[PDB]
Homo-oligomer: A and B are copies of this chain.
Amino acid sequence: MRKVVAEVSIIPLGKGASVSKYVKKAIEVFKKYDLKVETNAMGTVLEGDLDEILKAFKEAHSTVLNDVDRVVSSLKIDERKDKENTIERKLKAIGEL
């Protein structure tokens, strides 16, 4: 287990401004993995194994691409080896929990 905190956004192009079903489809993929999932208005934060996050990201990106012609997906990872890599700690450290 190599825990990290990440943020992902899967954006489909060519379908117009209303793409909520695609964003929802991606979130469903993340939930299939052993990850804590916190969705916000601009993306989804994930907490879990680095490899699992990488697999989930690829699957989320691919599942949306299956229904559209083009997708721009972003993955940001924040990992430190001196403290626990969790969403709770991160939030508590800045008074957002």
Q: Which residues of A contact B (CB under 8 A)?
A: 5-7, 11-20, 23-24, 27, 38-43, 45, 47, 50-51, 54, 57-58, 61, 65, 68-83, 87, 90-91, 93-96
Contact = CB atoms under 8 A, between A and B. Distances in A.
B76 A69 contact: no
21 contacts: A5-B42, A11-B13, A12-B13, A13-B16, A13-B17, A14-B15, A17-B69, A17-B80, A20-B94, A27-B95, A41-B45, A42-B45, A50-B58, A57-B75, A69-B81, A69-B82, A70-B80, A71-B78, A71-B79, A71-B80, A75-B75
Secondary structure of the A side of the interface?
mixed
Contacts of A24: 94-95
Given A15-B16, A71-B80, A72-B77, 5 more contacts: A15-B15, A17-B68, A17-B82, A20-B93, A69-B82
